[PDB]
Amino acid sequence: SPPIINHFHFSKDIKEGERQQVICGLKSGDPPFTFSWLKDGIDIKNFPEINIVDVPVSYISVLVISSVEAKHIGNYTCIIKNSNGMDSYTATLMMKVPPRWVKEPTDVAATLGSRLTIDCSATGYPQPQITWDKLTDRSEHQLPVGSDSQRTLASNGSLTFLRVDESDKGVYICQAYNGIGNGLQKKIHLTVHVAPKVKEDFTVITVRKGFTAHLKCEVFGEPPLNIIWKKEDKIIAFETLQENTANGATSDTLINDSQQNDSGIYTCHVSSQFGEAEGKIQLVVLE
Amino acid sequence: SPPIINHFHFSKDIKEGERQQVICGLKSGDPPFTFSWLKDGIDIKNFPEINIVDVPVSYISVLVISSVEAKHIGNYTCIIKNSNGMDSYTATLMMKVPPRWVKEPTDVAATLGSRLTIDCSATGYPQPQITWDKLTDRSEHQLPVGSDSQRTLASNGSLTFLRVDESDKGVYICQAYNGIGNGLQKKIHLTVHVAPKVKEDFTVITVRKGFTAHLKCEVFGEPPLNIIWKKEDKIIAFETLQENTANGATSDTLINDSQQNDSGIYTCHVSSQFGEAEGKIQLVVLE
């Protein structure tokens, strides 16, 4: 009689680490038998991390997978053949992974005119889809952002602004979904901020020799602002005062007793998280 | 005197699970002091999974991150202010993850004329780029596949064929790279196979009543082929012979002693891993 096969199945909620064994046994049929395994039409000898245990004395053969990586997903077929015919049965290895964050987005503070790039990554099986929705406080409604002119969404869901504008403020949301679970969703607040600017590009300070020369450098910006003075690309150690204000700060620094080798140009450099600026103040000591 | 800050730094080869602490302490400066923390221009009160330990008696404040998820990457700034000025210092939290396979590709056996979709996924930081190169055995050289007409590479590196052709045989390679390490590379063998076809769509078998009616159904295909006969969508249990060949198999089945309620149409259905076909054989019993 031809062989008939006992239906077999893989576990239900399979996870990457787990092992899996499926037994191909007989209902009926006269020996001798020959067992044979396939995965999606390819023979199982190919995949060596899969090895099959066969005990033909007991009329069975077992497929084993010691650790199920998602490549194992697919259809596995066992074929039993004798000198009267063959039976076969296929079982499906199924696996689902809901999204987990790779790169969560967070609240962002962007520089106007800069080229911002927010990242938002996630992983799972299938590979999750990353979508951005901005919240319009005209009625707190979601509207998908998308790759406009002056905007971009790269291969991996990274939202990139070409020139940041006051238009691009408020709260945004990226959403990772692959069909498993509800997915992920992250709401972030974008705020726009202005790069610092020295009020005056370059001012002349002229004095007679040997006086308390008084330098000046107020700058516009958002606190904090950290100002460093220089001469010919060397730091000034001399006495320096740095009083703050609201729209920035002013730096009043003075050099006591002037010299003709000190006469030249100086550099008021300011640094911040939103940019950096430089004013070059020049000094000449007349007789 | 204005406060001056002791430079601090995050660990060098940071990994997701680890904790990170950075101490903002003073070199010099006269009290009282006020400590303040920022991340990329945003204040640290926002991120609550970050909490700061501050002990102003010892002139220090510590930022702590109990488990560094990649969102923590960026620049952290500590600001110390007194009634003479402020100092500040920023340190960068850096993290790299080389690619690991999410969905490894494997050897594939495609049906001609079908719409194949090979998957190839990977994960890491930054999110890896997935590229396909086919090996031309004209000189075993790589050539990037790309989204042709009759081909496609989806968002996540899934290579999709619209109509599979003999053109699309041989070994291919997908390569995952994000800049860290050398990345990953996987070489797979594509082989093309033909869906089974019943030789004859529908044949008339006519006999007189009460004879050993002899049915016939050879089919073309690649082994294995599993044939099931039916009548009005019910299985035939009756005597059936299924002898194989090279290009497929033939199924010679016979019904002993005919009846007028048996007279009708029958269905030779074949199933395989590369497709399924049906021939409808018809029977009429004349007097």
Residue numbers in the entry:
A (entry chain A), B (entry chain A): 0 to 236, 243 to 292
Question: What do the paper's sentences say?
Answer:
Recently, a shortened Dscam (sDscam) gene family with tandemly arrayed 5′ cassettes in Chelicerata species has been identified, which encodes ∼50–100 isoforms. Chelicerata sDscams could be classified into two subfamilies, sDscamα and sDscamβ, containing one and two variable Ig domains, respectively. Crystal structures and cell aggregation assays demonstrated that both α and β subfamilies of sDscam used Ig1 for the isoform-specific trans recognition in a hand-in-hand manner.
These crystal structures of Ig fragments were determined at 1.3–3.1 Å resolutions.
